[PDB]
Amino acid sequence: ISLQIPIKLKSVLVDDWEYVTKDKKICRLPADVTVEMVLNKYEHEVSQELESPGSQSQLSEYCAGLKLYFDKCLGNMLLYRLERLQYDELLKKSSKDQKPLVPIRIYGAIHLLRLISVLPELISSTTMDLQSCQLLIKQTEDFLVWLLMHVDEYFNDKDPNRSDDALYVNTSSQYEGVALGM
Amino acid sequence: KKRPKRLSSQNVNYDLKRRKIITSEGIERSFKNEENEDFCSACNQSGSFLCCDTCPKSFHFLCLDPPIDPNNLPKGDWHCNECKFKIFKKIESNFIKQNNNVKIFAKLLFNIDSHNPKQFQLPNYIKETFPAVKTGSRGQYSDENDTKLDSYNPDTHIDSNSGKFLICYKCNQTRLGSWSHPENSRLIMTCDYCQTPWHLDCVPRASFKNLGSKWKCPLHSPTKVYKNYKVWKKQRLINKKNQLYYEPLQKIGYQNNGNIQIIPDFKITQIDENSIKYDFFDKIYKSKMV
Amino acid sequence: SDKRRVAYFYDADVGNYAYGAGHPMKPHRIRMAHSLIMNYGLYKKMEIYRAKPATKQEMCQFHTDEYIDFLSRVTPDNLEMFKRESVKFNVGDDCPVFDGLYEYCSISGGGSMEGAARLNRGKCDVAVNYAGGLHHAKKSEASGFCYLNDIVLGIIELLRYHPRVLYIDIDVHHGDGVEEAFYTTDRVMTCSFHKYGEFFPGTGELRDIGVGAGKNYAVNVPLRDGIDDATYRSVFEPVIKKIMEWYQPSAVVLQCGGDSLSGDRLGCFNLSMEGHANCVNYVKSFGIPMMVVGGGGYTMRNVARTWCFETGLLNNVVLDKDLPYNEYYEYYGPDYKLSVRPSNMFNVNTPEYLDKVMTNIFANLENTKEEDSAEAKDTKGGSQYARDLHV
Amino acid sequence: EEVTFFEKAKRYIGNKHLYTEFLK
DSSP states (O other), rough: OOOOOOOHHHOOOOHHIIIIISSSSEOOOSSSHHHHHHHHHHHTTTTTTOOOOSHHHHHHHHHHHHHHHHHHHHHHOSSSSTTTHHHHHHHHHHTTTOOOOOOOSSOOOOOHHHHHHHHHHSSSSSSOHHHHHHHHHHHHHHHHHHHHHHHHHHHHHTEEEESSSSSSSEOOHHHHHTTTTT | OOOOOTTTOOTOOSSSSSOOTTSSSSOOSSSTTTTSSSSTTTOOOOOOOOOOOSSSSSOTTTTSSSOOOOOOSSOOOOTTTTTHHHHOOOOOHHHHHSSSGGGGHHHHSSSSSSSSOOOOOTTTTTTTGGGTOEESSSEESSSSSSSOOTHHHHHHHSSSSSSSSOSSSSSSSSOOOOOOOGGGOOOOOOSSSSSOOOEETTTTOOSOOOOSSOOOOOOOSSOBOOOOOOOOOOOOOOOOOTTTOOOOOSSSOOOOOOOEEEEEEOOOOOEHHHHHHHHHHHHHHHHHEE | OOOOOEEEEEGGGGOOOOTTTTTTSSSSHHHHHHHHHHHHOOOGGGGEOOOOOHHHHHHTSOOOOHHHHHHOOOTTTTTOOHHHHHHTOOOOSSOOOOTTTTHHHHHHHHHHHHHHHHHHHSSSSSESSSSSEEEEETTOOOTSSSSBHHHHHHHHTTTTTTTEEEEOOSSSSOOOOHHHHHHSOEEEEEEEEEESSSSSSSOOOOOOSSSSGGTEEEEEEEEEOOOOOOHHHHHHHHHHHHHHTTTTOOOOEEOOOGGBSOSSSSOOOOBOHHHHHHHHHEEEEEEEEEEEEOOSSSHHHHHHHHHHHHHHTTOOOOOSSSSOOOTTTTOOSSSOBBBOOOOOOOOOOOOHHHHHHHHHHHHHSOOOOOOOSSOOOOOOSSSOOOOOOEE | OOOOOOHHHHTTSSHHHHHHHHHH
16 A cells, blocks of 8 residues: 655655745746656666567556546645645636646646655555556655665755745745645 | 731722622613534544534544635535444445546545545655654654743852752853852853853853753754755654665765764764874865865 | 944834734844834934835745745735645744735745845945845745745845845744755855754754855854853854954844843843854954844844844933833833843853854855845935824 | 874764764
């Protein structure tokens, strides 16, 4: 049921939690890397490092299912109380130019890993068969193993105080006051 | 003989407060006769809420997947995410085959509007892997956070743990002073990690802080040492089945970027002091040539 | 020391505003300071000036458009519907709203820009603005338990005539917004005296002296719970002397905050009349252009006493302790004397700590070396004098 | 010489609560 989150990525999640709550920092809205580019890197890299007996079929199927999962379940479990007004203003800007509300291509890999970690919280409370569960756990473990090597390129240790490539924008006093107000 | 209760002046305002004498008259010749809860089910927080009838909970105006500004009220009565399906062959069988390429996630996508939106909480197998991380009151990252006479100094210069006196590191003077002339007394705050004594004059501090993050004595490793650049953030400590591991086999040009448990995935390697001495002299020598 | 032309701007509407019940910070001290000045016979070497209300599009010079438009639209009858902008700028939660809020911000900003313009045209060497002094707020904030930052509104209004601007904060609850607004630029140097303990600003440190061009050019000193007059002299004279010997400013903005007096609601300092007078007296001694502004003071007697004393000495006259009869005759103390007695409360500050602060400050500073703008449109407002000398 | 640092630190710090942090 519970997937083997590596201890490095657990430290990454705790660091993100510290940045969000204690350090009061939120992710870049116009992030240079979102879920689209990390999955593009997945399909560009992992395809040629293994044989092709048909695993690409359910591999791409799981990638598409994850992409669909990241849309509706983003506004359900994700968005720590600081990020609610940034979500509101993002959807307002999307609706300003009549663009459809598509929030998957906005948030980076931090929210992707956060959604990955929150899977056993709601997987257990439904009629969901173990036969697909074992395969999903194994391939997600492969996903975390791939992310391990890519963790320095994707979650590089930087802060939003002297450069703009830290994948983080710091909270403002008005934004901090109004985000935790309502 | 102040006598304040004797005089009340009930004809006008009383006790800073104003009475109802101003509102007791209505003669004017101007017109010339022509349930809910304190907490929340999403983030366990208190604040502005929307009234509900189908459910006994309360939600914030900015804690919804389609959030709405409080000034512009929704038309009619607003309902929660699962309140829409609360009033209303299984639909799962047709929903699985209704769409393609989502088959392994069809059941997961089915359950999206059947439950309320909520703030994110770390699962029950992530935070406890590091013992330094503990859950907060409202969801904070808890790592280290929780004008009279000379009598402050005896309450601080004596801990009653062993009946001794604590001496500062920068200066070997406790400076408790004398009762007759207490101006020479200096306040000392102790560390919350190693209990190292410190005068308030050696370290640039001017007050005692007891709410918020605990004061750190500045004799430890930096947490965010900056050297484009590098932001070191440690690798924390692991108490889950001794996962941190201890493998001392090289201790040479180790290049383990710090994070050593000195003795006489994640890997907190073991180091000795002889290796630290040796590579310090090696670095000193290589700096001498350059 | 030297003879100076002191200008003082007062608006009668500042006095008749009450922030709320149980409110320490309040504007009524300004009217009694004005009454004490008027009844002390200081008009012989003074001119009275009327503070015009601040024009909307020139008020936006510091703050954002929506913040100013909200302040002109805020009132107690619609604060309940104004929830988003109420909690976004900390308005109504810690600082409650009241009738005539926008009027207060308008007249305060007008008085500050009036002082800045009088500095610009140079007819008056020193401008005194007790009506303003709101010095805790920010661009889109009402934090620090105030509503505006009119000093930074007046500082940049005098930048055109004065390239180098020096600001001093002497009271507790220092100028978070003042040093924040002029962080990265060397043109304005912000000096502030405050205590490390938690206050309405909360900010202030010994290592946050500047970034960018303003690096090493915004000195903050963390003080302790109450300073004696001699220790404050020893911590004030060398720092300001080194600043004027190194920075070479062409203007001085002095915050005459009464919050650091001997006994008020939130203050924790122990300076008497001598201690508070030396702050203004020292920075007067160089003769460079000056702008005295005051917003501090939680107790009326102490802040009115120190403001009357400052108004007295600033014109180089001997201000006696006796108070002439006025509308507030039974207000200031039992003996009715213009002297704030220093309380018998301990001196937490250390001479060794002060020496350490001096050494690190010197080692820090050794490395370094709109349709109405610049206008003084107002009225004298001295045709009618409201001197109530009859019981 | 440059080998006296060890016993200098042993005399000065003494306790291992801080010496190990000094080694770090």
